[PDB]
Design a protein around this ligand. Structure first.
Ligand code: HEM
Ligand code: HEM
Ligand SMILES: Cc1cc(N)nc2cc(-c3ccc(CCN)cc3O)c(F)cc12
Ligand SMILES: Cc1cc(N)nc2cc(-c3ccc(CCN)cc3O)c(F)cc12
Ligand SMILES: C[C@H](O)[C@H](O)[C@H]1CNc2nc(N)[nH]c(=O)c2N1
Ligand SMILES: C[C@H](O)[C@H](O)[C@H]1CNc2nc(N)[nH]c(=O)c2N1
Ligand SMILES: [Ca+2]
Ligand SMILES: [Ca+2]
Ligand SMILES: [Cl-]
Ligand SMILES: [Cl-]
Ligand SMILES: [Gd]
Ligand SMILES: [Gd]
Ligand SMILES: [Zn+2]
Lengths: 401, 402
């Protein structure tokens, strides 16, 4: 009943006893595995009680006095209001745990260090924008990036919700044409029409930072331009390919995801943007080389005078590696925090071992932990993993529209 | 049925075939174990046999025909009289092809219909086994124009031991456990190398010494057979532009011929049925040569390439691994030995998935094994959602026979 988990590079064995605690059901059954799929009243009180028990056991003071006082508080709250309020220390612990529980996050070795910005007193899109801009400024920190989450008001009955319509705080525009192609980021094609629809006058470059479409409960979403000096970008150059700079490639410093829902003890925060720093393959391999993203790999290969006529020259691989080199060099040159996939996966291995001792296991999504280049060159490739859903958790959620 | 999305193009399919999944995998709604390497009698044999016969008669578009009905009754009567049954020759060929077609971890299944099936079911000694295997190797190697083949030795049956090939592949390099705890040759083959010596093989000391075969006939200890060196086609490894690469003295063999899996067809089990195709270059270049627990040559190549191995952010590992994969492809193409790079192999697997969606409404595919070990998202299978499940006929892992 406790899955055996082996590391095939070292031969070491552990058992995931944490998987027993799995809150919610994943997509898999004994008949078929769907691990590779991207998107796989008194209920409130059972989850709330679960979380409080978690919390007090984690500070060692469960069973004891403040524990029961807190439980009867939440009981009375929900009886009075239909919902309840997290203590600020519970929100902090809940945000950290939700990060610590994220199976697809390779950066979780950092989970203890997270700046939680309590925006639960937020009203209006204009205040959200101020919280968000403060977040961006704090997290960017002139390039020495610091992990942060800003928690906007929870969903409540009868009332609408705070939503950030943008998937991330920094998103480059994607424009179609009557030639069908996209200029800019094909991923953001949709939020770009939405920004234009809502009044944004579009740029026409490959790296036009989008406005933020912030939405207050029931209110239409309001367009907000981000101060250029707030949005730190890194122009991309290569240490030895001097023509690489001239490709005009750039990316932004701050990976700040703003469309996921934070769930803590049955409470749901549909707006809680969090940010860390980038792993270099996210930019250099996925964002710039995905066929359905900037898809620049053949451009770079042409500039390297590679033989793109045959797959077997591995021109795709050589071009991809040099784009990742350019990303690493360019971020380092700009003194912007970045981590390469070897360092990050080596740290995740440490995280796995710490979590094995800390709580008997760690939910990890192998397909997402293994980097998108040089998979088996990293130690996570040889690490068996168990994927399960613990709470508190970050969850995907429907789009607001 | 599970909806399955390709994220490169946006296309959506539903895997209705998974609904027919026989045997259970290791996952539950509680927890996914899809990344685990080894996750794992009259009337159940009959449901397995009838389902197989039904598959055979569908494959030739004669379902519900009198030949179909008659064969089912024929199998029924033999199981009732004997507790087992015998495949017809045509069913064995079809069943071996189906087991390949059903292998979720095989990215090379575009080829599944082109399989030479050698019927060795009348084999009776380890010596005849060896002769069948040499024929297999000769046929499949085909002096470097590789041909997919399977030789099927006699099925398991009550009251008689199994035929087994102890080696995990027909061609393996010796792995000599140094007393330091280190290994000279291939660390993956330390156990089988020790069994070879203990069974009378006089070892070598090189890093690419072809192992002898340990062949087990029913109720008989394994017998040692040396492969004729001219049967074992090998490729010296050189790089197209890194001339010092040749000096590393690296080689690999032409023929990937796995010999330790169990073939299951219609509830019958064939514990010895070695099968072979041709290599995808990342198996040699990335896993076999660069796995830290295999030949582990990555640092040495990167040092020789003059890369800064003191910091990971130079991506020296990725650069050295790519050139090693280049060397493998260049060297096999030079030697005129079939090989496919991971880009061609994965593009062809995408075609396979499309063929199989039309043909059977789905395809069992193990994403972690289908995505190549380097450059994963540069290949289209990275962006393809996949459903992993177990169909029969099937190739299955089985215990080591010692
Ligand atoms: C500190 C440096 C961090 C690094 C290097 C890092 C790295 C990564 C990477 C590479 C991914 C895969 C994303 C993709 O492929 O698009 C990911 C996902 C994720 N990260 Fe981290 N991350 C960091 C910080 C954080 C923080 C601060 C949080 C939350 C407070 C967090 C929560 C998550 C979650 C929930 C996911 C998965 C979301 C999903 O299911 O799609 N991470 N991270
Ligand atoms: C013809 C060219 C072929 C290519 C390029 C190819 C490719 C591959 C690759 C790259 C793997 C993963 C191997 C590993 O990571 O160690 C694999 C696994 C596998 N292949 Fe193929 N293959 C071919 C032919 C065949 C044939 C002819 C058969 C059977 C008749 C077959 C059956 C299998 C099976 C059963 C597995 C998975 C075994 C396991 O569960 O570990 N393949 N193949
Ligand atoms: C905190 C954090 C840090 C980082 N360095 N990277 C991150 C990437 C994602 C992420 C972005 C988009 C998607 C869906 C589109 N592929 C899934 C994600 O996990 C994320 F949420 C959070 C990230
Ligand atoms: C027919 C075939 C062709 C090929 N080109 N490659 C193949 C690789 C494996 C294979 C080999 C070893 C292991 C376990 C050791 N990692 C698992 C496998 O799937 C296999 F069975 C069959 C293969
Ligand atoms: C189909 C497949 O699940 C999809 O391409 C996944 C694979 N692994 C991933 N891994 C990471 N880190 N990020 C991703 O977006 C994905 N996408
Ligand atoms: C732990 C993990 O499942 C293991 O390393 C797997 C991952 N994917 C693989 N994929 C292939 N094709 N071959 C392998 O040996 C492996 N190893
Ligand atoms: Ca037009
Ligand atoms: Ca008969
Ligand atoms: Cl990103
Ligand atoms: Cl191999
Ligand atoms: Gd030029
Ligand atoms: Gd040279
Ligand atoms: Zn699963």
């Amino acid at each position: 009943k406790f899955p055996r988990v082996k590391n095939w590079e070292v031969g070491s064995i552990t058992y995931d006893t944490l998987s027993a605690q799995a809150q919610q059901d994943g997509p898999c059954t004994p008949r078929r595995c769907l691990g590779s799929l991207v998107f796989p009243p008194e209920q409130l009180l059972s989850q709330a009680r679960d979380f409080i028990n978690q919390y007090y056991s984690s500070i060692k003071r469960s069973g004891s006095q403040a524990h029961e006082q807190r439980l009867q508080e939440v009981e009375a709250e929900v009886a009075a209001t239909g919902t309840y309020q997290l203590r600020e220390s519970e929100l902090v612990f809940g945000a950290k745990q939700a990060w610590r529980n994220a199976p697809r996050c390779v950066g979780r070795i950092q989970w203890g260090k997270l700046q939680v910005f309590d925006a639960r007193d937020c009203r209006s899109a204009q205040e959200m924008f101020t919280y968000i801009c403060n977040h961006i400024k704090y997290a960017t920190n002139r390039g020495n990036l610091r992990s942060a989450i800003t928690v906007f008001p929870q969903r409540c009955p009868g009332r609408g919700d705070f939503r950030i319509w943008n998937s991330q705080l920094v998103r480059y525009a994607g424009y179609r044409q009557q030639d069908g192609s996209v200029r800019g980021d094909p991923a953001n094609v949709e939020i770009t029409e939405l920004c234009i629809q809502h009044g944004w006058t579009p740029g026409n470059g490959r790296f036009d930072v989008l406005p933020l479409l912030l939405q207050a409960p029931d209110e239409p979403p309001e367009l907000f331009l981000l101060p250029p000096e707030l949005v730190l970008e890194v122009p991309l150059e290569h240490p030895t390919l001097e023509w690489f700079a001239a490709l005009g490639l750039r990316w932004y410093a701050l990976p700040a995801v703003s469309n996921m829902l934070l769930e803590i003890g049955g409470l749901e925060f549909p707006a809680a943007p969090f940010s860390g720093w980038y792993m270099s393959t996210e930019i250099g391999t996925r964002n710039l080389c995905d066929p359905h993203r900037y898809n620049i790999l053949e451009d770079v290969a042409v500039c390297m005078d590679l033989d793109t006529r045959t797959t077997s020259s591995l021109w795709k691989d050589k071009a991809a590696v040099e784009i990742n080199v350019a990303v690493l060099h360019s971020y380092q040159l700009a003194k912007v925090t970045i981590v390469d996939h070897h360092a990050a996966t080596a740290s995740f291995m440490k995280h796995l071992e710490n979590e094995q001792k800390a709580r008997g296991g760690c939910p990890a999504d192998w397909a997402w932990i293994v980097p998108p280049i040089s998979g088996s060159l990293t130690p996570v490739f040889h690490q068996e993993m168990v994927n399960y859903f613990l709470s508190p958790a970050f969850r995907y959620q429907p789009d607001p529209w």
